[PDB]
């Protein structure tokens, strides 16, 4: 643990990115109660304004403050991304582990099922199902869908890992002395797979944010009067030519988030060589 | 060869046949096309509902509905939309429009990505690698719609600043162009510049990283050193002996990049106003119409599996460990 | 008022050149009276090539057209006889002289006495009694049965005159004008319709008794309404109506393109459902909700960078340009301190958040077209009603199903869509504003308004007809009928070389003078 | 005449994150035509760095100084497009690992054709391919015309090494550079490769620089030797002088710890303690000082120089006067006498009859078919007595490791009967199976894969104890006693495995196997893959443990020099059949079968006389 941490600590870009992500999450949840304008208030005397001394990041075509809208979009989008990444990693881990542990025709059938699921792009299937989830206050169902249709590409890596590590010598050595199978599982496989599961979650974070925001752009995701980042971008592109800030500010924020996530993922991966 | 390229085709046929079924039960469960005509405050008389449901086929279980759907699809009939118009009339045009874009985007993306990945893995940790591996990060970290809208903004700025219409970003072709094949072809390319560039950026971004990892793995082996120990130069041994052996893994990842391109084409088509399968899919899920979507998912599965099969042919042609053992 | 064409004298304008305009679809039927045939775009096309009796100034004032009818003059009042006299020197495109036969044929076709036709409406030719011979062959004399005030509405404005050979026999009217029009009398004549190429072309007429067009061709394309701005950028078409601020900004930053604005007669409005069963069933609640929505704010926010100082439209019959447009809006003033005060006194006391009668809650359904521009009005009305407790639930219906499934049969409590004013507005009423008559969705109406609507257009004097129409306007504002939100600021972006062509709003263009700026 | 190769003051230092490792520090030598010079040494001594620096194929971060002159023209600082004119046409390189030394997408005949086609430009492919077939015949690949179209994955390791040699000698070079060409090869294959190399040197007439770590190859191929330690030559003389009249103490230790088939069972070796120095930032003085059995303080002030000791003999030591004529045991002060074997128990602890194990072969990736039954285990009958050792010897593909791992599963095989301590494992319920696993424990092959990478040594050693019912008061004492028995310091009980050095990991593996005081150890090649000077220490440890405790081993190995030392009985295995058995001395001195004598004839012996 200590050597790994000080291996990551070395990666200045990765730690900077991770600190930026934590800062953005904390500010998204803690700053809005301090701003002069709430996200729902409408200021009809200042429409499409540049960043000024009253609306710190300007307003959109309706007079809504842009800062508060962006913060609420960040809340929704980042929370969904994190939750979906966690659930997808859990599902992928369980399926890949069982498939790679049983071996034989169970493994063949499970991997064939995974391929059959991968035959059609995941975005298409999610968009097909989404009419049911939409029109529902709880975002639980959207998270459940995004997680349940996004695990099939990493479960293959998990299965490769399980197969590779099941045959490694110290497992057989533990067998040859009377170590109970439960003790093997709690003591020999979990410590050696936990870190790579963490890495997988770190990348599925960005994957899920991308999927959810792309969904919201077309109108299938989060529906008004709630706002996600994709919704803000979709509204902004309507009047992007006249006043471009309304499109370029949320877009920039989104790109920043994604860059940070990707950087952290890569850094963490290269810190577990 | 023609025992690994045959058992690899029955597999694709079975996969497609089962996918075209599982994504019809999924569609017929998710979509309820009458949920708005059974909820109006002056709710219409029941006999209207029965007539509309019978006309739309939602009276028999899912299995019978799917059986009739296949019995008609194999005979070139694809049902009707929710407003009466047939699907077969539009299907050919939409397929053509989508394929024109996908082929160009994929070809340019994979070629550029392979070249950049090889260059980065050869010149590891030099300045060029450092700049390229972060440009790939940026391109991979911005969603498709952000890229498309930024390109539209840039094109508008360029047109306004220069003073003439350099770039066009609307429709597959421009209206009112009478002329021969050459005029129409130049016009078509003028429009094809940007939408295909949008997909090429993402494809190159992904394939650069994948190729860089593959070539790094190859450079960690000893046949390059052997090849240079016979008198080959560094470049001749790196290209003839090292790059070709690194090209093998790429032929297995092509069917994944193609799925990514299919996903991104929906956005590229919605934003630039192209009339293809992405626009049709958005229009089909917006109104919850079963036959449009049932055709689009079949087309998507077929295009992924075709790319997979061609990639497997390439992989057999390049790698001798499958032609003979 | 004050149309905003590039006023240049016709003589100095160069002789020749094309004029490439746009359409939305190839007209399946060319007959301009047949129900499918008629439309805004097709009527606009045929405007250039047909005869009309009256030409309307920038404010709806009608003056006789000396080209075609030397003098259309009413002569009596008890039977309402009007003497339409044809120009001595006038004939069709096939050389058959124009005579009263054409007038009689078209009046009979529009009469609806024999329902072998699909005429749009019998307005103006249902009250006709008899048109017969004059002193000379080139004069008709129309005697009416019920006195009429709008009588200029036939052979004028949006309705032109048709050849006798095409309106006499019912089969011809039904099915005749499908592949090109028949004879025409207008300074241009249609010469080619490349249905395979999606294009119409008009060319100078050989037999024009009047002036010479400063043009040569008005070739019409069929561009869809999305590649209509990006095709004025190229040299494909040179005219377009720009709607939003986005495309207004795009067009203004272009070489050779100038933006011209004179308010068009196209407004956009709320309408309330008064059928029994919906919440907006009673006069008082309907009239107290409308006193808690800011129309001035809705206008000033909706069209931000389209006009300067945008005020809403506050008259039901006349649009801003017309004459006789006084502010008829004193019954609702937006104050939420008289709205909320007779609202709770009415019996809708305030509960948690939104107020409710305890047997029901204020929830009002607001179906609107799914577009982005139409959503702003709903999102502003919703926020300005929330301060009163009226929860406005806004359902974004879209496209084709909006006027058939949901609006056409109640299925709504407040619906927003656009009407279209005209320089002859006295017929929009007795259609929309009455107990019966189609297009009165949300069947609100009273016996007195129906009694005072047959007196506004049984008059014989415009100076009094306008007063009666505005009294009707009082009667319709006074009972929660509908809220006229905005008037579209007709902005057309045209090639800066065009002259005597641009945004004229309600007024009518002169197709003999359009031409091109010299060189 | 300009000498064929002259290296002077060569120095090679890579660069890493921390200190720059100075791999080679100032060596110098000279190779003449028709002569063989062997650089001996082991672990990290910079032999391979010197080879790849002479050739020019060092990685792109290694920094090289000094002087290297090939027949007259210098090679350091030549551009790549100018140094590639010598490679292949005057230098022929043979590399270490054959299993990944050939590009896998070209037919081997085409790879030799490319070798012979780049340096002679106008040969024409029609002649290059014919010459490639001639070379394939010359090296000794069977029936070469057909095999000239075989991709590299369709050949065994010996075939691949033969193809690499064919590539090396394609253009008739003038200097061969062999970089451990016969490690990771079977014994007989290695003998054949040495014959091939001798034939290549005779036909070519070149001079060879062979880089080995074993002494038999040096005594059987080379003509002079240079012993390398810590990146410097420490002794250099003829092979006969080096084996007979060595002077540097490192050479004494290196030659005293090489097992010999001549030795009787139970003879101890002479292990050099410690581990080779880390080359990043040496301390001053002799690099051998930390491990030298004669080290005095003078040896620490300054580093000795390669000094002339005898006629054509140089030693880098200052106390050689005390090494001449003294046997390695005398210098290192060890007793190599085999202790008189006491009368042990003569009972039988393992007994296998007629054992057989099958393996199906399947062709087809997605769908598998049944075409053949390879019998890697066919009809084996062996047995083991108390206090003795039975060494199973065979080559790769002989089904000895699988026989061991089949015995260790303690289950009923397809045929034959397995007796362990008197219980026929077919009649063994799982309770008795758990009760018996406390009397036979296994020592694995790969030290680093047989240990949990992220567990302190205490946990690894106490795993058998914790899993079998010992309290936290007792496992502490038992683990403390075990570290002293094996040889590690108590202070290592809190150190992770990854920081131990090669031999200590195997020592920990032995300790873990030794926890429950079993009566049988099953050793699976646990000493190969180690430096010779560490093999000696572990071998002595095993012999002493058997002498003192009374253990019984089951020793599976591929080389026979140590099996002579350890095993009391032997069992030669061929393709899954035990072809010979009996007491070790009789089999190893008077063999009968043809395979056994082929095997014994193919083992090198470090006697050059
Ligand atoms: S010089 Fe000294 S330390 Fe070095 S090997 Fe000789 S005696 Fe040992």
Torsion sign, CA atoms D274, D277, D283, D285: positive
- DSSP per-residue letters across D352-369: EEEEEEEEEE---SSS--
Question: Which distant-in-sequence residues (6+ apart) come within 8 Å of A261 by Cβ?
Answer: A17, A21, A81, A202, A205, A206, A209
- C-alpha D317 to ligand 1 mean position (Å): 5
Residue D199 and residue D245 share a domain: no
Residue D431 and residue D314 share a domain: no
Query: In chain C, which segments carry CATH 3.10.105.10?
Result: 267-487
Distance set, CA D441 to CA A142, C237, D190, D444, D546 (Å): 54, 92, 33, 10, 14
Q: Classify residue A185 as exposed, middle or buried by CB count within 10 Å of its CB (0-12, 13-18, 19+).
A: exposed
Q: Give the chain B residue nearest C399 (alpha carbons).
A: B287
End-to-end CA distance of chain C: 31
Beta strands in D221-341 (DSSP E): 224-229, 232-238, 307-310, 313-315
Which of C306, C290, C314, C315 is CA-nearest to residue C384? C290
Given an 8 Å threshold on Cβ–Cβ distance, is C249 in contact with A241? yes
Q: Is D469 on the interface with A (CB under 8 A)?
A: no
Bridge partners, D442 (sequence order): D522
Question: Which distant-in-sequence residues (6+ apart) come within 8 Å of D422 by Cβ?
Answer: none
End-to-end CA distance of chain A: 13
d(CA B308, CA D152): 28
Q: Classify residue C136 as exposed, middle or buried by CB count within 10 Å of its CB (0-12, 13-18, 19+).
A: exposed
Query: In chain C, which segments carry CATH 3.90.76.10?
Result: 40-178
Q: Classify residue C63 as exposed, middle or buried by CB count within 10 Å of its CB (0-12, 13-18, 19+).
A: exposed
Given an 8 Å threshold on Cβ–Cβ distance, is C380 in contact with A48? no
By the 8 A CB rule, do D460 and D512 touch?
Answer: yes
Q: Is C249 on the interface with A (CB under 8 A)?
A: yes
By the 8 A CB rule, do D92 and D206 touch?
Answer: yes
Torsion sign, CA atoms D279, D280, D285, D289: negative
Q: Whose CA is nearest to atom 6 of ligand 1?
A: D317
B170 contacts in chain C (CB < 8 Å): 226-227, 230
Which of C487, C485, C483 is CA-nearest to residue C298? C485
Q: Which CATH number fits domain C267-487: 3.40.50.740, 3.90.25.10, 3.10.105.10, 3.40.120.10?
A: 3.10.105.10
Does A contact D via 3+ CB–CB distances below 8 Å?
yes
Residue C25, preceding bond cis, omega within 30 degrees?
no
Distance set, CA D520 to CA A178, B81, D481, D509 (Å): 16, 79, 20, 15
Q: Closest ligand 1 atom to the C-alpha of D286? A: 4
Place of tokens 């199976």: D433
B312 contacts in chain A (CB < 8 Å): none
Decide: helix, strand or coil at residue C228. Answer: coil
Question: Which distant-in-sequence residues (6+ apart) come within 8 Å of A59 by Cβ?
Answer: A43, A46, A47, A48, A49, A65, A66
Half-sphere exposure of C483 (CA within 13 A, CB side): 29
By the 8 A CB rule, do B209 and B195 touch?
Answer: no
Residue D281 and residue D243 share a domain: yes
For residue A225, the distance in angstroms to the closest alpha carbon of chain D comes to 52
Which backbone phi and psi does D376 adopt, to 5 degrees? -70, -10
Residue D432 and residue D303 share a domain: no
Residue D286, marked binder? yes
d(CA C462, CA C151): 11
Q: Is D80 on the interface with B (CB under 8 A)?
A: yes
Q: Given this structure, which CATH class describes domain C40-178?
A: alpha beta
By the 8 A CB rule, do A37 and A55 touch?
Answer: yes
Which backbone phi and psi does D505 adopt, to 5 degrees? -65, -40
Given an 8 Å threshold on Cβ–Cβ distance, is D100 in contact with B221? yes
Which of D29, D6, D5, D36 is CA-nearest to residue D238? D36
Tokens encoding C478: 């006074």
Which of D220, D193, D101, D205 is CA-nearest to residue D153? D101
- Enumerate the domain spans of chain B: 7-323
Number of Cβ atoms within 10 Å of the Cβ of B29: 12
- Report the CATH number of the B7-323 domain: 1.10.3720.10
Residues C481-514 as b/e (b if ≥16 CB within 10 A, e otherwise) read: bbbbbbbbbbbbbbbbbbbbbbbbbbbbbebbbb
Tokens encoding A99: 């498939």
Question: Which distant-in-sequence residues (6+ apart) come within 8 Å of D167 by Cβ?
Answer: B226, B230, D111, D112, D115
Which of D235, D228, D256, D435 is CA-nearest to residue D315? D235
Distance set, CA C289 to CA A206, C194, C391 (Å): 48, 54, 11
Cross-sheet strand order for the sheet of D91-94: D91-94, D175-179, D207-211, D36-40, D224-229, D232-238, D313-315, D307-310
Given an 8 Å threshold on Cβ–Cβ distance, is B245 in contact with D81? no
By the 8 A CB rule, do B8 and B309 touch?
Answer: yes
Which backbone phi and psi does D290 adopt, to 5 degrees? -60, -20
d(CA D417, CA D356): 10
Question: Does the C-beta of D391 come closer than 6 Å to ligand 1?
Answer: no
Tokens encoding D77: 């600082």
- Please name the chains neighbouring D, where neighbouring means 3+ C-beta pairs under 8 angstroms: A, B
Q: Classify residue D417 as exposed, middle or buried by CB count within 10 Å of its CB (0-12, 13-18, 19+).
A: middle
H helix count then E strand count, chain D: 21, 22
By the 8 A CB rule, do A212 and A84 touch?
Answer: yes
Of B8, B226, B234, the CB nearest to D80: B234
By the 8 A CB rule, do D216 and D532 touch?
Answer: no
Here the CATH number for the domain that contains residue A127 is: 1.10.3720.10
C198: left (phi over 0), alpha (psi -120 to 50) or beta: left
Residue D592, marked binder? no
Does B contact D via 3+ CB–CB distances below 8 Å?
yes
Decide: helix, strand or coil at residue B162. Answer: helix
- DSSP per-residue letters across A210-240: HHHHHHHHHTSSS-TTS--HHHHHHHHGGGT
- C-alpha D301 to ligand 1 mean position (Å): 11
Of all residues in chain D, what percent are helix, strand and coil, respectively (each to 5)? 35, 20, 45
d(CA C121, CA B131): 72
Q: At what angle do helices B62-73 and B290-318 cross, to 10 degrees?
A: 60
- Please name the chains neighbouring B, where neighbouring means 3+ C-beta pairs under 8 angstroms: A, C, D
By the 8 A CB rule, do C272 and C392 touch?
Answer: no
d(CA D440, CA D452): 21
Residue D389 and residue D300 share a domain: no
Domain that holds residue A141: 2-25+66-270
Residue D178, marked binder? no
d(CA D166, CA D94): 9
Beta strands in C322-423 (DSSP E): 363-367, 391-395, 414-418
Q: Is A148 on the interface with B (CB under 8 A)?
A: no
Tokens encoding A29: 């949840």
What method was applied to determine this entry? cryo-EM
Q: Closest ligand 1 atom to the C-alpha of D249? A: 5
Task: Determine how β-strand C363-367 pairs with β-strand C391-395.
Answer: parallel
Radius of gyration of chain C (CA): 25
By the 8 A CB rule, do C210 and C87 touch?
Answer: no
Tokens encoding C63: 């003056």
For residue A36, the distance in angstroms to the closest alpha carbon of chain B comes to 30
A241 contacts in chain B (CB < 8 Å): 153, 156
Question: Which distant-in-sequence residues (6+ apart) come within 8 Å of A113 by Cβ?
Answer: none
Question: Does the C-beta of D300 come closer than 6 Å to ligand 1?
Answer: no
Question: Does the C-beta of D537 come closer than 6 Å to ligand 1?
Answer: no
By the 8 A CB rule, do D512 and D485 touch?
Answer: no
Residue D375 maps to a domain: yes
d(CA A84, CA A76): 12
Residue D62 maps to a domain: yes
Does D contact C via 3+ CB–CB distances below 8 Å?
no
Distance set, CA C506 to CA C220, C261, D249, D493 (Å): 22, 12, 115, 98
**Discontinuities in chain B (C→N > 2.5 Å), after residue:** none
Question: Does the C-beta of D288 come closer than 6 Å to ligand 1?
Answer: yes
Q: Is A218 on the interface with C (CB under 8 A)?
A: no
d(CA D581, CA A272): 50
Which backbone phi and psi does C209 adopt, to 5 degrees? -75, -15
Domain that holds residue D105: 5-222
Given an 8 Å threshold on Cβ–Cβ distance, is D101 in contact with B11? no
- C-alpha D250 to ligand 1 mean position (Å): 8
Residue D96, marked binder? yes
SS3 annotation, C463-475: HHHHHHHHHHHHH
Torsion sign, CA atoms B57, B59, B61, B62: positive
d(CA C37, CA C27): 7
d(CA B102, CA B196): 8
Question: Which distant-in-sequence residues (6+ apart) come within 8 Å of C159 by Cβ?
Answer: C32, C33, C153
By the 8 A CB rule, do B28 and B290 touch?
Answer: yes
Which of C376, C381, C383 to mutate to test binding with chain A, by most A CBs within 10 Å of its CB?
C383
Place of tokens 């609306």: A55
- C-alpha D287 to ligand 1 mean position (Å): 8
Residue D398, marked binder? yes
Structural domain count, chain A = 1
Residue D429 and residue D289 share a domain: no
Question: Which distant-in-sequence residues (6+ apart) come within 8 Å of C33 by Cβ?
Answer: C106, C109, C110, C119, C120, C159, C162, C167, C173
Which backbone phi and psi does C220 adopt, to 5 degrees? -105, 130
- C-alpha D21 to ligand 1 mean position (Å): 23
Q: Classify residue D69 as exposed, middle or buried by CB count within 10 Å of its CB (0-12, 13-18, 19+).
A: middle
Given an 8 Å threshold on Cβ–Cβ distance, is B145 in contact with A255? no
Structural domain count, chain D = 3
Residue C98 DSSP class = P
Pocket test for ligand 1, best of D246, D253, D289, D301 (most atoms within 8 A of CB): D289
- DSSP per-residue letters across B44-89: PPHHHHHHHHHHHTTTS-HHHHHHHHHHHHTTT---B-TTS-BSHH
Q: Where are the alpha helices (DSSP H) in chain B?
A: 7-30, 46-56, 62-73, 88-122, 127-141, 144-162, 181-219, 223-229, 234-236, 244-250, 254-272, 277-286, 290-318, 320-323
C233 contacts in chain B (CB < 8 Å): 165
Q: Give the chain B residue nearest C234 (alpha carbons).
A: B165
By the 8 A CB rule, do A242 and C245 touch?
Answer: yes
Residues D90-104 as b/e (b if ≥16 CB within 10 A, e otherwise) read: bbbbbbbbbeebbbe
Q: Give the chain A residue nearest D410 (alpha carbons).
A: A176
Q: Is A213 on the interface with B (CB under 8 A)?
A: yes
Chain B window 1-30: which residues touch A at a Cβ cutoff of 8 Å?
A: 15-16, 18-19, 22-23, 26-27, 30
- C-alpha D282 to ligand 1 mean position (Å): 15
């Amino acid at each position: 643990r200590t050597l790994v941490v000080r291996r990551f600590l070395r990666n200045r870009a990765a730690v900077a990115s991770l600190a930026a992500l934590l800062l953005l999450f904390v500010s998204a949840y803690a700053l809005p109660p301090l701003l002069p304008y709430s996200y729902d208030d409408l200021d009809f005397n200042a429409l499409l304004q540049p960043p000024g001394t009253k609306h710190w990041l300007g307003t959109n075509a309706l007079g809504q403050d842009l800062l508060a809208q962006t913060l609420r979009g960040m809340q929704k989008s980042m929370l969904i991304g994190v939750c979906v990444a966690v659930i997808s990693t859990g599902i992928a881990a369980t399926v890949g582990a069982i498939s790679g542990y049983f071996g034989g025709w169970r493994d063949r059938t499970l991997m064939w099922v995974v391929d059959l699921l991968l035959v059609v792009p995941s975005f298409i299937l999610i968009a097909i199902v989404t009419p049911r989830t939409k029109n529902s206050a709880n975002i639980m169902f959207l998270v459940l869908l995004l997680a349940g249709f996004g695990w099939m590409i990493s479960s293959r890596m998990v299965r490769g890992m399980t197969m590779s590590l099941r045959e490694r010598e110290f497992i057989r050595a533990a067998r040859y002395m009377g170590v109970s199978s439960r003790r093997i599982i709690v003591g020999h496989v979990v410590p050696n797979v936990a870190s790579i599961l963490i890495i997988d979650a770190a990348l599925n974070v960005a994957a899920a944010i991308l999927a959810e925001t792309g969904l919201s752009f077309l109108g299938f995701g989060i529906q008004p009067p709630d706002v996600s980042l994709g919704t803000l971008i979709a509204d902004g592109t309507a009047s992007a030519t006249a006043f471009p800030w309304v499109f370029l500010f949320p877009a920039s924020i989104l790109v920043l988030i994604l860059v940070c996530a990707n950087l952290t993922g890569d850094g963490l991966r290269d810190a577990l060589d | 060869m023609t025992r690994y390229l045959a058992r690899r085709l029955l597999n694709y046929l079975v996969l497609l046949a089962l996918a075209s079924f599982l994504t019809y039960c999924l569609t017929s469960l998710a979509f309820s096309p009458l949920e708005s005509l059974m909820q109006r405050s002056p709710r219409p008389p029941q006999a209207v509902i029965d007539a509309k449901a019978h006309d739309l086929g939602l009276d028999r279980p899912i299995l019978a509905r799917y059986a009739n759907w296949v019995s008609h699809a194999v005979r070139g009939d694809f049902g009707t939309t929710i407003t009466g118009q047939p699907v077969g009339t539009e299907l050919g045009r939409r397929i053509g429009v989508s394929l024109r874009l996908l082929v160009v985007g994929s070809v340019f993306g994979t070629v550029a990505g392979v070249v950049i990945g090889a260059w980065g893995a050869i010149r590891q940790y030099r300045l060029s690698d450092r700049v390229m591996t972060t440009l790939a990060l940026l391109v991979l970290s911005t969603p498709t719609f952000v890229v498309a809208n930024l390109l539209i903004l840039g094109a508008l700025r360029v047109n306004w600043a220069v003073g003439i219409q350099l770039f066009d970003y609307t429709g597959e072709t421009s209206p009112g162009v009478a002329g021969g094949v050459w005029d129409r072809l130049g016009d078509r390319l003028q429009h094809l510049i940007l939408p295909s560039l949008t997909l090429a950026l993402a494809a190159a971004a992904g394939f650069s990283r994948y190729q860089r990892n593959a070539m790094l793995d190859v450079l960690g082996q000893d046949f390059i050193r052997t090849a240079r120990a016979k008198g080959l130069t560094r470049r001749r041994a790196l290209l003839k002996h090292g790059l070709r052996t690194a090209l093998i893994p790429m032929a297995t990842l092509f069917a994944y990049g193609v799925a990514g391109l299919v996903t991104g084409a929906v956005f590229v088509e919605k934003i630039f106003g192209w009339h293809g399968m992405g626009e049709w899919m958005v229009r089909g899920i917006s109104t919850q119409d079963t036959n449009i979507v049932a055709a689009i998912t079949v087309f998507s599965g077929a295009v992924v599996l075709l790319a997979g099969l061609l990639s497997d042919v390439i992989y057999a042609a390049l790698d001798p460990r499958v032609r003979v053992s | 008022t004050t149309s905003d064409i590039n006023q240049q004298d016709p003589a100095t304008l160069q002789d020749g050149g094309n004029l490439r305009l746009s359409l939305t679809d190839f007209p399946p039927n060319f007959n301009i009276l047949h129900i499918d045939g008629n439309n805004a775009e097709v009527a606009a096309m045929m405007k250039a090539t047909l005869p009309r009796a009256f030409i309307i100034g920038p404010d709806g004032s009608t003056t006789v057209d000396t080209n075609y009818f030397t003098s259309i003059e009413l002569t009596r009042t008890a039977p309402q006889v009007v003497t339409y006299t044809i120009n001595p020197e006038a004939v069709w495109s096939d050389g058959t002289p124009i005579t009263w036969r054409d007038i009689a044929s078209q009046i009979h076709a529009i009469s609806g006495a024999d329902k072998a036709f699909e005429i749009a409406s019998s307005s103006g030719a249902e009250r006709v009694a008899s048109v017969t011979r004059g002193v000379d062959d080139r004069q008709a004399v129309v005697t009416f049965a019920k006195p009429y005030a709008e009588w200029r509405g036939m052979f004028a404005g949006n309705g032109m005159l048709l050849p006798a050979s095409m309106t006499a026999t019912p089969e011809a009217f039904n099915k005749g004008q499908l592949d090109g029009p028949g004879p025409s009398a207008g300074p241009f004549v249609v010469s080619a319709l490349d249905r395979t190429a999606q294009r119409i072309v008009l060319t100078r007429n050989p037999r024009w008794w009047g002036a010479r067009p400063r043009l040569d061709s008005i070739t019409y394309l069929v561009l869809d309404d999305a590649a209509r701005l990006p095709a004025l950028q190229n040299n494909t078409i040179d005219a377009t109506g720009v709607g939003t601020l986005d495309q207004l900004t795009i067009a203004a930053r272009t070489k050779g393109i100038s933006i011209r604005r004179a308010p068009g007669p196209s407004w956009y409005h709320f309408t309330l459902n008064g059928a029994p069963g919906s919440i907006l069933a009673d006069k008082a609640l309907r009239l107290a909700i409308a006193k808690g929505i800011d129309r001035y704010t809705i206008a000033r926010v909706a069209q931000y960078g389209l006009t300067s100082d945008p005020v809403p439209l506050n008259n039901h019959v006349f649009v801003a340009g017309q004459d006789g447009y006084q502010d008829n809006s004193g019954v609702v003033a937006y104050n939420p301190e008289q709205a909320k005060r007779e609202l709770d006194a009415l019996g809708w006391r305030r509960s948690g958040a939104f107020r409710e009668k305890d047997g029901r809650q204020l929830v009002i359904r607001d179906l609107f077209y799914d577009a982005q521009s139409t959503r702003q009005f709903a999102q502003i009305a919703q926020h300005t009603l929330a301060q009163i407790g009226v929860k406005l639930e806004l359902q974004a219906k879209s496209g084709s199903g909006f006027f058939s499934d949901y609006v056409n049969v109640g299925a709504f409590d407040i619906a927003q869509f656009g009407a279209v004013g005209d320089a002859f507005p006295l017929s929009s009423l007795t259609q929309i504003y009455a107990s019966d008559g189609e297009s009165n969705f949300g069947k609100i109406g009273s016996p007195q308004i129906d009694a005072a609507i047959e007196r506004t257009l049984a008059e014989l004097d415009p100076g009094k007809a306008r007063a009666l129409a505005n009294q009707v306007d009082e009667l319709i504002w006074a009972e929660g009928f509908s809220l006229p939100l905005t008037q579209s600021p007709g902005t057309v972006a045209v090639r800066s070389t065009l002259a005597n062509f641009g945004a004229t709003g309600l007024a009518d263009l002169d197709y003999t003078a359009i031409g091109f700026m010299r060189r | 005449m300009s000498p064929l190769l002259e290296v002077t003051d060569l120095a090679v230092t890579f660069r890493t994150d921390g200190d720059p490792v100075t791999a080679v520090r100032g060596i110098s030598y000279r190779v003449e035509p028709g002569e063989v010079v062997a650089m001996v040494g082991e672990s990290g001594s910079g032999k391979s760095a010197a080879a790849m620096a002479v050739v020019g194929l060092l990685p792109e971060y290694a920094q090289v100084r000094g002087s290297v002159r090939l027949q007259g023209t210098e090679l350091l600082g030549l551009a790549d497009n100018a140094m590639s004119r010598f490679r292949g046409k005057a230098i022929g390189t043979v590399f270490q690992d054959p299993m990944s030394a050939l590009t896998p997408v070209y037919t081997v005949g085409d790879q030799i054709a490319e070798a012979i086609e780049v340096h002679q430009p106008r040969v024409g492919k029609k002649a290059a391919r014919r010459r490639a077939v001639e070379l394939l015949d010359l090296v000794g690949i069977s029936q070469p015309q057909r095999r000239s179209r075989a991709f590299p994955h369709e050949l065994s390791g010996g075939e691949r090494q033969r193809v690499v040699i064919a590539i090396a000698i394609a253009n008739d070079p003038d200097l061969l550079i062999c970089d451990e060409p016969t490690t990771a090869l079977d014994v007989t294959v290695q003998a054949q490769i040495l014959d091939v190399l001798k034939a290549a040197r005779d036909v070519t007439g070149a001079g060879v620089l062979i880089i080995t770590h074993d002494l038999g190859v040096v005594a059987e191929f080379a003509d002079r030797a240079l012993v390398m330690y810590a990146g410097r030559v420490v002794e250099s003389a003829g092979v006969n002088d080096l084996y007979r009249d060595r002077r540097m103490p490192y050479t004494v230790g290196l030659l005293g710890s090489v097992p010999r088939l001549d030795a009787a069972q139970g003879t101890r070796l002479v292990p050099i303690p410690g581990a080779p120095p880390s080359l990043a930032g040496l301390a001053p003085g002799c690099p051998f000082a930390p491990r030298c059995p004669l080290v005095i303080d003078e040896c620490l002030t300054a580093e000795p120089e390669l000094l002339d000791v005898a006629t054509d003999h140089r030693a880098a030591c200052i106390r050689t006067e005390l090494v001449t004529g003294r046997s390695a045991a005398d210098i290192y002060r060890v007793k190599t006498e085999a202790r008189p074997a006491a009368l042990g128990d003569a009972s039988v602890v393992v007994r296998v009859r007629h054992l057989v194990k099958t393996y199906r072969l399947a062709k087809g990736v997605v769908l598998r078919r049944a075409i053949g039954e390879v019998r890697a285990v066919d009809g084996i009958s062996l047995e083991l007595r108390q206090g003795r050792t039975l060494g199973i010897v065979g080559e790769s593909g002989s089904g000895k490791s699988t026989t061991l791992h089949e015995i260790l599963e303690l289950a009923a095989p397809q045929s034959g009967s397995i007796e362990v301590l008197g219980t026929d494992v077919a009649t063994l319920g799982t309770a008795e199976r758990r009760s018996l696993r406390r009397d036979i424990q296994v020592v694995f092959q790969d030290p680093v894969a047989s240990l949990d990478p992220r567990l302190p040594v205490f946990d690894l050693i106490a795993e058998p104890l914790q899993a079998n019912g010992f309290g936290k008061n007792e496992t502490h004492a038992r683990v403390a006693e075990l570290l002293d028995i094996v040889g590690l310091r108590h202070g290592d009980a809190s150190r992770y495995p990854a920081e131990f050095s090669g031999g200590q990991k195997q020592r920990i593996g032995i300790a873990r196997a030794l926890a429950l005081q079993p009566k049988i150890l099953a050793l699976d090649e646990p000493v190969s893959a180690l430096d010779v000077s560490i093999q000696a220490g572990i071998i002595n440890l095993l012999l002493d443990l058997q002498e003192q405790f009374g253990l019984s081993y089951l020793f599976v190995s591929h080389d026979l020099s140590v099996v002579k030392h350890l095993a009391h009985q032997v069992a030669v295995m061929l393709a899954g059949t035990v072809v010979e058995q009996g007491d070790s001395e009789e089999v190893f001195g008077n063999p009968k079968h043809e395979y056994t004598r082929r095997l014994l004839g193919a083992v090198p012996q470090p006697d050059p006389a």
